[PDB]
Amino acid sequence: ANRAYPYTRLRRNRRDDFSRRLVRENVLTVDDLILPVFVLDGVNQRESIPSMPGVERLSIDQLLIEAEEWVALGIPALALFPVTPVEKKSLDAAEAYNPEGIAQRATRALRERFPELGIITDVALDPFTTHGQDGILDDDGYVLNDVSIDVLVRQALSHAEAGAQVVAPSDMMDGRIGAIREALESAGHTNVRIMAYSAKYASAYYGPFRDAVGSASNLGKGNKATYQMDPANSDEALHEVAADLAEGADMVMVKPGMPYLDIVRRVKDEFRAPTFVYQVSGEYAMHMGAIQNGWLAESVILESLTAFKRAGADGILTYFAKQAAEQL
Amino acid sequence: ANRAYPYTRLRRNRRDDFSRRLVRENVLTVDDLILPVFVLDGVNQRESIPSMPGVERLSIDQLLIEAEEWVALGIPALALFPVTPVEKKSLDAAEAYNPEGIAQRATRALRERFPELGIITDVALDPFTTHGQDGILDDDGYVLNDVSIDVLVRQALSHAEAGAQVVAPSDMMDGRIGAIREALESAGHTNVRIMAYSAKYASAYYGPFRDAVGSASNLGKGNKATYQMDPANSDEALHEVAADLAEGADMVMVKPGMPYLDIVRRVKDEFRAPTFVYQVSGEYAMHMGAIQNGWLAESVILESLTAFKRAGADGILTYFAKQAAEQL
Amino acid sequence: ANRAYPYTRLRRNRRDDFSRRLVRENVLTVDDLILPVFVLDGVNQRESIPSMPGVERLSIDQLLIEAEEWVALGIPALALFPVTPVEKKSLDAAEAYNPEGIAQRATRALRERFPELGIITDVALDPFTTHGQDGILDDDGYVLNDVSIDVLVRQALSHAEAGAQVVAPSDMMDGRIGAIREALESAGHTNVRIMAYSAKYASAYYGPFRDAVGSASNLGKGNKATYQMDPANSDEALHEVAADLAEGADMVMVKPGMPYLDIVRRVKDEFRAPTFVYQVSGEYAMHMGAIQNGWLAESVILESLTAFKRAGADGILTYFAKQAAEQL
Amino acid sequence: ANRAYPYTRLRRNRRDDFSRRLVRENVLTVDDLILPVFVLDGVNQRESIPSMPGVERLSIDQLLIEAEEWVALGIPALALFPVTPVEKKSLDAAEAYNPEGIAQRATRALRERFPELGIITDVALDPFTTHGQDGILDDDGYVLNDVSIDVLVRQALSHAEAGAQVVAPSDMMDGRIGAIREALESAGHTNVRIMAYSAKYASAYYGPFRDAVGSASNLGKGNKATYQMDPANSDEALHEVAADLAEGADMVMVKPGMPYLDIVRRVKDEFRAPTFVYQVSGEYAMHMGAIQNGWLAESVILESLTAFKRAGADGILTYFAKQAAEQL
Amino acid sequence: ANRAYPYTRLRRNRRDDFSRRLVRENVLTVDDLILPVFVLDGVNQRESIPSMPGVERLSIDQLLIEAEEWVALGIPALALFPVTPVEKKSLDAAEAYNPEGIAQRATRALRERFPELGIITDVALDPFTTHGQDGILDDDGYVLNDVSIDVLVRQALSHAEAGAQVVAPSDMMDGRIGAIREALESAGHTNVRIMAYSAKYASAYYGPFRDAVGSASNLGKGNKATYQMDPANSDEALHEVAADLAEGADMVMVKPGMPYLDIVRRVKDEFRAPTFVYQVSGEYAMHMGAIQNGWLAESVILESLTAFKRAGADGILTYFAKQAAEQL
Ligand SMILES: *[C@@H](CCC(=O)O)[C@@H](C)NC(C)=O
Numbered sequence A, B, C, D, E: 001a002n003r004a005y006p007y008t009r010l011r012r013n014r015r016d017d018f019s020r021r022l023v024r025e026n027v028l029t030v031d032d033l034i035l036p037v038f039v040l041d042g043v044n045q046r047e048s049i050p051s052m053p054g055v056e057r058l059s060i061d062q063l064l065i066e067a068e069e070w071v072a073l074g075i076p077a078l079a080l081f082p083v084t085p086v087e088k089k090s091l092d093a094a095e096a097y098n099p100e101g102i103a104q105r106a107t108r109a110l111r112e113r114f115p116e117l118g119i120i121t122d123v124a125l126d127p128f129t130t131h132g133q134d135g136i137l138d139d140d141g142y143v144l145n146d147v148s149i150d151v152l153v154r155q156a157l158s159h160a161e162a163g164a165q166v167v168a169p170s171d172m173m174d175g176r177i178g179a180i181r182e183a184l185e186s187a188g189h190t191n192v193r194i195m196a197y198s199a200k201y202a203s204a205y206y207g208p209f210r211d212a213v214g215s216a217s218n219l220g221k222g223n224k225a226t227y228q229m230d231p232a233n234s235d236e237a238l239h240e241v242a243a244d245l246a247e248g249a250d251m252v253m254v255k256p257g258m259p260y261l262d263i264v265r266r267v268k269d270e271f272r273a274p275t276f277v278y279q280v281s282g283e284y285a286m287h288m289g290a291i292q293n294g295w296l297a298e299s300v301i302l303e304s305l306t307a308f309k310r311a312g313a314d315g316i317l318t319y320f321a322k323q324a325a326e327q328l
């Protein structure tokens, strides 16, 4: 609009707190926060994760206890990640759909205790396979697409049966959203939301999640690269999201987060649909490490989360959800 | 994105409060609120306005007292509207730039008492002319454009001298923003913001403001129609805003509000600049009347304000600012 | 284009390395890298920076020696940051334009020794003021815009006189690019490029830079907030860039980097001009801390830089430039 | 953005090599190169092609030997073109799907010897028909669309059975991509890519390919014009590409190349999908002829390939792939 | 528009000549052709150019004779290129503005003999400098921008004085179009058109032009690269064109041609202004070489020219203009 100095001085609105508040484009609130939680089997168990300072793996009893504080803070949902015992792992990932699996038990307990709390279950095979890869392997070690979808569908159904309001398919198999949707619709789970991990990249930022859960130790290399997206590609993410919306997803997600803010922006602008983003384990760890060392002020936590809002995210999966909910 | 029932059911996200909160596109906060206030001369004066139930005209001492509660609620700014004594009115609108006028006195007092509170003064001649029209009249009763700008410029300078952080030129004279900007820059008032009333319509919704201030009793007819915009025109508002941004405005405003939400949307989308909207006296009165009669629930207040945010407004001038700041 | 599973399987292109390479949208090369360097006064001085593991402050002799390896690796440019002795600081920031200042001496030495190496000098007052703020302060501690520009202009001229091919104004004063351009043109420095820090945010990610240089210890708060951009604002960055291009900038920059990738994307798309991004000290430190702790694989370095390319950056200022130039 | 001389001088970035490198918009790499190769029957056979100086037709043993150097150079894929013996030609193009045809034998040999090398087979009937036209002819000499698709489908299946990672249907029959996709999916060849020749023009630039392979001697005239695109049409190419993506293509191609760079640009911009371009035999020959004559410097080779990248191509089929891979 | 096989078969319109003609998007006509001609000093001189088979350098008498046939064919304009005698070359390029220079003499003769024929003179210093570079050199061999513009302005004025309807500034100096326009307007040459070479690349395709004229023997390397555009850059061409239109150009040109068709497309789409393209000497030579060798049919000539029309060119500078005008 032909704005020119000195008629236009962009510092005027910045002069005072009141005018900064008046022109501020985005605001972060507790409504934007989803807390991922690592869930152990057994009872009375709490375990620190060395590569995620401050994060604990919790047995279900402990989870129920901690959840009361998260509900009180107004965090709208949890994303559950079971820490499967090694003895429950198999080549067919059968534990994924065990009605008495950790995820199913934890969902039933939380739905009963806190009916208004959102439970987002993880539809994925990596915590259940002996090899820790994100699906069923053929003879050459390749993750079979359609065979893996059969297991994911059973898993999603078992989560719906346990009372999950949202199932979140996080393994990058083609066409899984449509298959899971068809199965939920056919079984009468009309209102179970699907939060698709639509543009999930072959990233090294998932490093600490291995320590937390005990899944694949290989990250961002040749095996993952046959289903997770190449970090170099942006246009391809639009094709991923378009397919997931056509297949019935209620929400779509970009993962990792901060290293992919341009993707969040393009996805929100292109589809105008509910868009989510995951601030992953490695993003949490690198921030925490710098804070603990006195290299960065604790204020980077809210700045990092404000960035997701500005980029177009409706909600953010973040291990900082509790700390953020206090600072807000 | 080829979304189709039953794969897509838009009710799933609506099923539960937590998912509604996760997908909610806009949130209203106290940062979005500007409270207009009617200011009397003298001391220890409070007067109810019959056509604006609940709104009082206040002398400066009373204003200072009430402002403490508004600051406490976190309202970022006030928009001052002096109620000029009839004996101070003139054909040349000289009281507009009186260093001891109500607006100037009130600004000095508030800037000293509450340094962080935003003061938005009204750059307009209607409260100062004997005839109550929005400028200086020629022999035929026509509001002269450039002669009126000379007075507005002096008025804006007097507001800057009194300490106003923002001057808000509300009479629709062409080119006034550039003239006021040049004068402020030349006088060294480098950081005084200009909140232009850019797309201000020839509306009947200003009815109760006459009762509040004692300005022109004619609204939305032949005289006003020679400077205020025709309610039928939308494209013309884009040309108004473009000119005001080129001339140096820091913020641009649409007025009235709810009857012009499509204009707020087009202005925000077209220019991506700080966009404000005025929920005028008549919008306040019609809501209040219906609430008092038991015809509408008090919840329409937050719904009306949420509409401005959804349409693209960064801030809202609203007589409901105090009530809203409590309900939020 | 109505792409649907199973006719469309986005995994097919991901199946093999050769097809991933064929469809890869972006490639990072040494041509994209700019190395920031901290320069000490004196001779035979090297100092480790505790909050930036692996980064050293170097006297000019040491810089000349290290630069031979950077040139050999094919890094196209350095961005110089002098570490001003406390005794050279003043209220008028006079050392900024000292023909014998560290930046000027280092520029002359490098231009002579490596004629093809790009030297990007820092046009900024924070390393030269006693208080460490980004300009000249008035009585209230406010950074004066136009008075600061007078000093920046002299500084930019002194850099051009020392042989700098690029001057990079990094303090967010309004209109500085036009003022610096007019002065360079009037003095006959027709080909000195201006790399504007156009959208530079009021960020906490600059933490370790304080330790490196000894500038302002306050970051992302009330003083910085009167000139650096609010992290919440995206549209405002487009207005910043538009002004800098109109004023004559040859290149425009977003800072910080990864937490602002959506801004890089919008700026590149909106203006189609040479766009740069700064992976700042705090981004370097948090990555390095996690790598050193064994929490993240060293591969996150190339992933972080690939993200800037994918988002639309033409070049990247990064303390990882040497390590990246080897891994590429 | 109101850029004006002399504030803006576009020569500043051009002044020095380092700044040219910093602002360079596109870079060509070996990852962008696909080498077409002409394959003979028999053993120990190498034949020069007079109209393609430097290009040889090779028997499979020779191809295996030469391929080691191409793999070493990092060329990601070959596009195979069999030179069918006259005695193997027929009206029903049966040799197209012979499990012991040249293309099938060459694919099996290369997949075994170099597992990481991409093999792109040619799905086309012109090398197999007695008449050399691109399909099966009816009584009037018209190329029948759906009858030709039946043969192409068998051919594509035979290539998948031989181990081809990519099948590239190059005869312009309507709907062939969908038919080939359905057949591959139904047969369990889930990951065989389809590189569609989507916008293939009725061009005279294919002249030397006749000499290389021995297919149709008529080019760009009345018969070809009933399936290949009219050189005058641009919008029509968007409809061709849209259909091929809907039908399941993993990659889409424009052919010829340089005379159709505007088409490459429109296709990439319109669909944001993996886009390929063929620098055909005639483009190779005209460049080579001029180089050999001393009329053009050898640098036109990299300039020609850089043009495809700038226009939006992800990969380039080019007889210059080996020479380019050395100069890069 | 959801077009799908077999409801949509794109071959139907291709079935018959009549329907191809009905849907053909672009048509080439003699109105699109501009013939470049090389002009010698003296009388009764014709010289063949070995690297441009079929092209002759002509003295003015011969040019006048040949022009009668070009006018008869309906070619709308000639672009004149003088072949300056070595004894007329100088460091100050003074022959460029000699009222008795070849270009000026040829213009006067042609304007008198064929008043309706368009004469496009070349505003450039390379045929007049001893060194053959495209401007006046400083001590370091750098082409000075503003000093070169002073000479170009005199040259353009001398062409207007000689009767040229169009002056075509072909040396890439910044701001030259505005300078030439101001001078023409101030001298009263109100209707002299400026055909700006706006996006002229640092290309190797100009090879044969050296043989024709005797200008710089260096092409597409380090000296040319400081003013001609980098072949890798597309967005930059939009900035070049925008500046030339703002400065007063009546027509804008892309050069070279076929290797830059994507640029022609972007320029036409972005500005909707009269857009021209130069099919340069090297494009002519490579086509001619292949035709003479029997490698390409003569039909590639019309296909090459049809490509420029399809890409968005209004007119084409082409050495094939006479041959094309016959085949059309
Ligand atoms: C994503 C990783 C989350 C994190 O790193 O914090 C989840 C769904 N699991 C895997 C195996 O990628």
Ligand SMILES: *[C@@H](CCC(=O)O)[C@@H](C)NC(C)=O
Pocket (backbone or CB within 6 Å): B122, B124, B126, B170, B205, B206, B207, B208, B209, B215, B278, B279, B280, B281, B282
């Ligand atoms: C606008 C009217 C506000 C209202 O009606 O509440 C102001 C600036 N004044 C006039 C006279 O229109």
Ligand SMILES: *[C@@H](CCC(=O)O)[C@@H](C)NC(C)=O
Pocket (backbone or CB within 6 Å): C122, C124, C126, C170, C205, C206, C207, C208, C209, C215, C278, C279, C280, C281, C282
């Ligand atoms: C930017 C900070 C760079 C960093 O943190 O690495 C520079 C130009 N200086 C300041 C004071 O912000």
Ligand SMILES: *[C@@H](CCC(=O)O)[C@@H](C)NC(C)=O
Pocket (backbone or CB within 6 Å): D122, D124, D126, D170, D205, D206, D207, D208, D209, D215, D278, D279, D280, D281, D282
């Ligand atoms: C295209 C021609 C390639 C070339 O000319 O180099 C191929 C697929 N075949 C035909 C017959 O057009």
Ligand SMILES: *[C@@H](CCC(=O)O)[C@@H](C)NC(C)=O
Pocket (backbone or CB within 6 Å): E122, E124, E126, E170, E205, E206, E207, E208, E209, E215, E278, E279, E280, E281, E282
């Ligand atoms: C352009 C070259 C034309 C050609 O190669 O045919 C002209 C204007 N001159 C130069 C020196 O580039």
Ligand SMILES: [Mg+2]
Pocket (backbone or CB within 6 Å): A124, A125, A126, A134, A170, A171
């Ligand atoms: Mg997984």
Ligand SMILES: [Mg+2]
Pocket (backbone or CB within 6 Å): A172, A173, A174, A175, A198, A240, A243, A244, C010
């Ligand atoms: Mg997917």
Ligand SMILES: [Mg+2]
Pocket (backbone or CB within 6 Å): A309, A312, A313, A314, B025
């Ligand atoms: Mg949002």
Ligand SMILES: [Mg+2]
Pocket (backbone or CB within 6 Å): A031, A032, A313, A314, A315, B021, B022, B023, B024
């Ligand atoms: Mg939200």
Ligand SMILES: [Mg+2]
Pocket (backbone or CB within 6 Å): B124, B125, B126, B134, B170, B171
């Ligand atoms: Mg008024």
Ligand SMILES: [Mg+2]
Pocket (backbone or CB within 6 Å): B172, B173, B174, B175, B198, B240, B243, B244
């Ligand atoms: Mg106006």
Ligand SMILES: [Mg+2]
Pocket (backbone or CB within 6 Å): A025, B309, B312, B313, B314
């Ligand atoms: Mg808003």
Ligand SMILES: [Mg+2]
Pocket (backbone or CB within 6 Å): A021, A022, A023, A024, B031, B032, B313, B314, B315
């Ligand atoms: Mg707001």
Ligand SMILES: [Mg+2]
Pocket (backbone or CB within 6 Å): C124, C125, C126, C134, C170, C171
């Ligand atoms: Mg600074």
Ligand SMILES: [Mg+2]
Pocket (backbone or CB within 6 Å): A010, C172, C173, C174, C175, C198, C240, C243, C244
């Ligand atoms: Mg700025």
Ligand SMILES: [Mg+2]
Pocket (backbone or CB within 6 Å): C309, C312, C313, C314, D025
């Ligand atoms: Mg780029």
Ligand SMILES: [Mg+2]
Pocket (backbone or CB within 6 Å): C031, C032, C313, C314, C315, D021, D022, D023, D024
């Ligand atoms: Mg680059």
